[PDB]
Amino acid sequence: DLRLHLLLNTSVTCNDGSPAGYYLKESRGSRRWLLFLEGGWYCFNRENCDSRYDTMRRLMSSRDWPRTRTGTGILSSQPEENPYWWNANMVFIPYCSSDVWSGASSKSEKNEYAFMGALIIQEVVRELLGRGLSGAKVLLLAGSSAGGTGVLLNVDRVAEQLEKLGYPAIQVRGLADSGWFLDNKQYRAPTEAIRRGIRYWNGVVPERCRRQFQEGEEWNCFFGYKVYPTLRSPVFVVQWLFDEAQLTVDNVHVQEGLRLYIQNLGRELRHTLKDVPASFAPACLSHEIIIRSHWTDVQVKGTSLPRALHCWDRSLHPLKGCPVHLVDSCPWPHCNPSCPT
Ligand SMILES: Cc1ccc(CN(C)Cc2ccccc2)o1
Ligand SMILES: *[C@@H]1O[C@H](CO)[C@@H](O)[C@H](O)[C@H]1NC(C)=O
Secondary structure, three states: OOEEEEHHHHHHHOOOOOOOOEEEEEOOOOEEEEEEEEOOOOOOOOHHHHHHHHHHHHOOOOOOOEEEEOHHHHHOOOOOOOOOOOEEEEEEEEEOOOOOOOOEEEOOOOOOOOOOOHHHHHHHHHHOOOHHHHHHEEEEEEEOOOOHHHHHHHHHHHHHHHHHHHOOOEEEEEEEEEEOOOOOOOOOHHHHHHHHHHHHHHOOOOOHHHHHHHOHHHHHOOOOOHHHOOOOOEOOOOOOOOOOOHHHHOOOOOOHHHHHHHHHHHHHHHHHOHHHOOOEEEOOOEEOOOOOOOOOEEEEEOOHHHHHHHHHHHHHHOOOOOOEEEEOOOOOOOOOOOOOO
């Protein structure tokens, strides 16, 4: 199991002012570190954050967190469950900031809630350097859903943090799972909700992307195909072609009109990944995968996701029989027989 540590700097807080934290299982024979960002949507004004505090409070507060968590999927220490990185040092960072890991605002006389996701990541990294991270060869920042978008927003800032602190030898990389969305036309909106969120959170985006889109337009950097070309750290993108959260925001729940909509969505997502050299994108209706225990089951062109990630590792030392770019071409959900049931 992974053991809970609340942050020693208690000014870095969850939404309600309680300390943020992380779950850790050390592997003293390994110089690889996996830091995973939890997901779970977000809230963008006082009224909908109040609702979330009533019935999704573990995503806003550490008051009720358990002392341990079992590592699953890519966070498992068993080679049978995790062929990729079973011997790595494992970290799970709970999502308690409701800001897609972008915020830098404290609770105050003028703010009912604190939104400190970007600062939580920074503080976890700093405290881990005293526990063994200082000796690392590779730090893989991973995440699912809102945490997958969080990887895209934060991987280059972690790389800059470690450089400025005097650790140029640690290679920082990103793994974004189910966080690559389209700002597309709905079947019957994310952009306006994210625009309001950034102002409510004092949200921050990567510097090069901010400089392209400029003031008032930072919401663009929450969309994978717009922020990814601005990033310097290596990033592997995992994305279902028919993501259930994408379909929810598109108001989709089969006649000709809906058939054409769904096929066009799959084609648009394929297009945005054409020039992403490390990626895994199966033609399935699902959401998240990398901390699911049966993440080993799905394959594209005969290659599993743990295998693709291992091939990525080798590429960062094309490879015969070890591909890193894997995108399905068939045009309908479950045209891949290995899709989750
Ligand atoms: C279960 C879950 C957590 C987060 C999400 C994705 N959801 C579309 C939120 C989002 C993320 C990034 C950008 C815009 C919106 O699903
Ligand atoms: C705690 O975190 C805050 C916000 O990031 C920072 O301003 C402060 O310097 C930190 N305290 C210490 C002792 O590092």
